[PDB]
Curated annotation (Swiss-Prot):
Residues 198-560 are annotated as: Polymerase. The keyword DNA-binding applies. This is DNA polymerase I. One of its GO terms (cellular component) is cytoplasm. Residues 1-194 form the 3'-5' exonuclease domain.
Length: 560
């Protein structure tokens, strides 16, 4: 198994200072913190752990307060002895989800600085679809080691203990093991990551620098007006009653209108209006959402608990929800959005002068696409044509299988195929891309984004598992969706740097789809929007035609 003889529990300063001296001379060391809560901003540091070499790790208990708990170094003294080491940028650390730990230390005024390696992101950048990227999974995969699970020392259910209640030595085995395993995994994954400058550029210059900015995004939280949300819940209660009554009176077709409307509001009320006001943190009075950094196959950040991505972008009731995200007094919400980013990326990936020109001369791409495909002057393109072209363009982004146009644009048959081929006859660059990408997906087994991030398609060569074609679709969509992700991430890191260095009255409060949202002082908006705009357009990829439309207002809906 593993127990009390492997790792040392440090209960005295002299031993702690000895360990700090060896940490000071270690090239990299593993670091971990243990707390009494998963809520980063209300969690309390219960103990910390380090590892300097495979198998040599210690646990420093600073706040186990169970009955007759053995005396331990006080939290304040342990932190002042450890503070200069922790805050030293040249002292490199390895950790598993260093986003959590950086936050825990920020609760005590400490800025973690050697955030050099996170084993969750090492794993993720190696092959995002390999499996779960959590420590216990990795230990089995890369080290064939079965780790002590948290519920093995704490329990399960309502009567699960909190870390400070666990005995010192049981706590120590778990925490020192965490430190140790993280270091071992680092040693087995880092030389592999070095093998390919693609994945190494993305881990080093995109994944890793973002760990402290996601921590800053999450701890800032978003300010929400729950009154608004309560009124909205009351109204939806009444509207669902009325809509039910409308369909009962009824027993281009009225009944298959009110039912749909019912379903839509019904869901929205529960998924947002009833839950969002119950997600306010009592210490900050804000809602702090969880950005998951190593979950999507494409490298896009996904958020949960307030999954901001699922609130209805174009819906009147969706707008209503976006009005509850409020800017504090004398500040305004600013929204910096990247315009049709995957369609601009596809313009460069397809290397097509037609698409590249539309964007270059400021044209609405859907009208230009419709003008060129249908062969009509740009000023007389009707809304039905703009809409048909839009259906081709967003289909291309999702690699959507030709009849897909006939289901989105739920009306033609091979007339849609006529549209598809006509498009390629005017925009040939789009199929040279699709042929090329499918090809390397089958040749290499993976596709790449512009910065080197890779998506492994292990079914591109599936012996005709029919929907094996989904990997070909994924083959053409991943380069576009992943380059969008990388660009957003480079923008986040570039903007956070400026905010950290110049310290203006602004804070980055959320990231959703291709948008970065901020709170900024009403008197500072004009310059802050100018710099946000310039940083997002010029400090990312300069080969893709980028456009950031910036907005501001007293709530998110006005900003958007």
């Amino acid at each position: 198994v593993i127990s009390y003889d492997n790792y040392v529990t440090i209960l005295d300063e002299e031993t702690l200072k000895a360990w700090i001296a060896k940490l000071e001379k270690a090239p990299v060391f593993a670091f971990d913190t243990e707390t009494d809560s998963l809520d980063n901003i209300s969690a309390n540091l219960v103990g910390l752990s380090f590892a300097i070499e495979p198998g040599v790790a210690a646990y420093i208990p600073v706040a186990h307060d169970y009955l007759d708990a053995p005396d331990q170094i006080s939290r304040e003294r342990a932190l002042e002895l450890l503070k200069p080491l922790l805050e030293d940028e040249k002292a490199l650390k390895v950790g598993q989800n260093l986003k959590y730990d950086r936050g825990i230390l920020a609760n005590y005024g400490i800025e973690l600085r050697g955030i050099a390696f996170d084993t969750m992101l090492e794993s993720y950048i190696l092959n995002s679809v390999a499996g779960r990227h959590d420590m216990d999974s990795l230990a089995e995969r890369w080290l064939k080691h079965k780790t002590i699970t948290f519920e093995e020392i704490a329990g399960k259910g309502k009567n699960q203990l909190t870390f400070n209640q666990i005995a010192l030595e049981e706590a120590g085995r778990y925490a020192a093991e965490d430190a140790d395993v993280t270091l071992q995994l680092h040693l087995k994954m880092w030389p592999d990551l070095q093998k390919h400058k693609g994945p190494l550029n993305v881990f080093e210059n995109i994944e890793m620098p973002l760990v402290p900015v996601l921590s800053r995004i999450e701890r800032n939280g978003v300010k929400i007006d729950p009154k608004v949300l309560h009124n909205h819940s009351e109204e939806l209660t009444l509207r669902l009653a009325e809509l039910e009554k409308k369909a009962h009176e009824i027993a281009d077709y009225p009944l298959p209108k009110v039912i749909l409307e019912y379903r839509g509001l019904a869901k929205l009320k529960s998924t947002y209006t009833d839950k969002l006001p119950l997600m306010i943190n009592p210490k900050t009075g804000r809602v702090h959402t969880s950005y998951h950094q190593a979950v999507t196959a494409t490298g896009r950040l996904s958020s949960t608990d307030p999954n901001l991505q699922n609130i209805p972008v174009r819906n009147e009731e969706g707008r209503r929800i976006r009005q509850a995200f409020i800017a504090p007094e004398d500040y305004v919400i600013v929204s910096a959005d990247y315009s049709q980013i995957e369609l601009r990326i596809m313009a460069h990936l397809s290397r097509d002068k037609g698409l590249l020109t539309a964007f270059a001369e400021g044209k609405d791409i859907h009208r230009a696409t419709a003008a060129e495909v249908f062969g009509l002057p740009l000023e007389t393109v009707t809304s039905e044509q703009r809409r048909s072209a839009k259906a081709i363009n967003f289909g291309l982004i999702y690699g959507m299988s030709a009849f897909g146009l006939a289901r989105q644009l739920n009306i033609p048959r091979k007339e849609a195929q006529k549209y598809m081929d006509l498009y390629f006859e005017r925009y040939p660059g789009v199929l040279e891309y699709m042929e090329r990408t499918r090809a390397q997906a089958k040749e290499q087994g993976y596709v790449e984004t512009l910065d080197g991030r890779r998506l492994y398609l292990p079914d591109i060569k599936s012996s005709n598992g029919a929907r094996r074609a989904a990997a070909e679709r994924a083959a053409i969509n991943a380069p576009m969706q992943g380059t969008a992700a990388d660009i957003i991430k480079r923008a986040m890191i570039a903007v956070d740097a400026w905010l950290q260095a110049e310290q203006p009255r602004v804070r980055m409060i959320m990231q959703v789809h291709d948008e970065l949202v901020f709170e900024v002082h009403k008197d500072d908006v004009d310059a802050v929007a100018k710099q946000i705009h310039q940083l997002m357009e010029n400090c990312t990829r300069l080969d893709v035609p980028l456009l950031v439309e910036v907005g501001s207002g007293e709530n998110w809906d006005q900003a958007h």
